[PDB]
Amino acid sequence: MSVIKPDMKIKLRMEGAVNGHPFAIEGVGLGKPFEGKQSMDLKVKEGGPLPFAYDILTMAFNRVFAKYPENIVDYFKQSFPEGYSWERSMIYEDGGICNATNDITLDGDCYICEIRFDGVNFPANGPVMQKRTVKWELSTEKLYVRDGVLKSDGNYALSLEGGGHYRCDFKTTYKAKKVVQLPDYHSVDHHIEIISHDKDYSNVNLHEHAEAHSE
């Protein structure tokens, strides 16, 4: 509790590859852990202009920024100052698959995030490589306990240019770096949005709003 403040800073770096194309992105941000809101400025440092849709990256760019009611255990605010890491697979319906990890530490009032992101098998004719995505729809993450850690699933969808949706299945494992109380089964609704961007998304402002529920 005492380590989590109403306003806290974010620093992150992402390294990765999509279809073998390497890149690196750094971010600085700000968030309100109790109101479940955060914003960040992201700059592509290497591998730009990115030849794939930026939207496959945005949910990789921290569940401490989610509004939790008093009747649901908060795995994430419990884990600090030591922090926690996660592991995630994102399986798109045309066979592209992204794996990603994130190690989250706290230094003072600033979350430090190291992200590895690796996607493969995106077809050259598909919405990702041709940059035909518009936005993520509202995403409901379902969290449950297995083997003493916290897992989650999600059936998410990107709306496309010209209509229709592009489905992706998310599978996440969360691992706190210290012993914490484990929550019951519950949900978190996420709204993610690219607020601003330049010509080739070398500069992007990203916003997220997340709230937890269980009834």
- Experimental approach taken: X-ray
- Cα–Cα distance measured from residue 183 to residue 198, given in angstroms and rounded to the nearest whole number: 40
1 exposure class (CB count in 10 Å sphere: 0-12, 13-18, 19+): exposed
Candidates 41, 62, 44; CA nearest to 52 is 44
Distance CA(40)–CA(214), nearest Å, equals 28
Task: Give the pair of three-digit tokens for residue 155.
Answer: 């059936």
- Single-letter amino acid, residue 38: Q
Burial of 68 (0-12, 13-18, 19+ CB in 10 A): buried
For residue 169, which of 5, 65, 59, 51 has the smallest C-alpha distance?
Answer: 59
User: In the block, which residue shows the tokens 């004719």?
Assistant: 125
The full 3-state SS of the chain, as one line of letters, equals CCCCCCCEEEEEEEEEEECCEEEEEEEEEEEECCCCEEEEEEEEEECCCCCCCHHHHCCCCCCCCCECCCCCCCHHHHHCCCCEEEEEEEEECCCCEEEEEEEEEEECCEEEEEEEEEEECCCCCCCCCCCCEEEECCEEEEEEEECCEEEEEEEEEEEECCCCEEEEEEEEEEEECCCCCCCCCEEEEEEEEEEEECCCCCEEEEEEEEEEECC
Contact predicate 14/24, CB 8 Å: yes
Cα 195 to the center of its chain, rounded Å: 16
Residue 161 CB coordination number (10 Å): 11
Q: 25 and 43 in contact (C-beta within 8 Å)?
A: yes
- To one decimal, the resolution in angstroms is 1.9
Beta bridge mates, 94: none
**Contacts made by residues 41-47, CB under 8 angstroms, sequence distance 24+:** 41/203, 41/204, 41/205, 42/203, 42/204, 42/205, 42/206, 43/202, 43/203, 44/200, 44/201, 44/202, 44/203, 46/22, 47/21, 47/22, 47/23
